[PDB]
Amino acid sequence: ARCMPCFTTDHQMARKCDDCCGGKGRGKCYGPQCLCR
């Protein structure tokens, strides 16, 4: 399912997950998975 991981130790995890999913607001970190909304 995941675009990439979300690691809580990475304080920029939400910005990285958005980048994976195509831009601002497009990715959600849900536990350890970046999911493209």
Listed in sequence order, the residues at least 6 apart from 21 whose beta carbon sits closer than 8 Å to its beta carbon are 3, 27, 34, 35, 36, 37
- Helix/strand/coil (H, E, C) string of the chain? CCCEECCCCCCCHHHHHHHHHCCCCCEEEECCEEEEC
Q: Are 32 and 4 in contact (CB under 8 A)?
A: no
Method: X-ray
Q: What is the resolution of this structure in A?
A: 1.0
Listed in sequence order, the residues at least 6 apart from 10 whose beta carbon sits closer than 8 Å to its beta carbon are 16
C-beta atoms surrounding 8 within 10 Å: 9
Q: Are 5 and 34 in contact (CB under 8 A)?
A: yes
* Count, residues in the chain: 37
Please choose, from the candidates 5, 1, 22, the residue with its C-alpha nearest in 3D space to the C-alpha of residue 13. Answer: 5
Q: Are 29 and 17 in contact (CB under 8 A)?
A: yes
Question: Rounded to whole angstroms, what are the CA distances from 23 to 6, 18, 20?
Answer: 16, 5, 8
C-beta atoms surrounding 9 within 10 Å: 5
Domain boundaries, the chain: 4-36
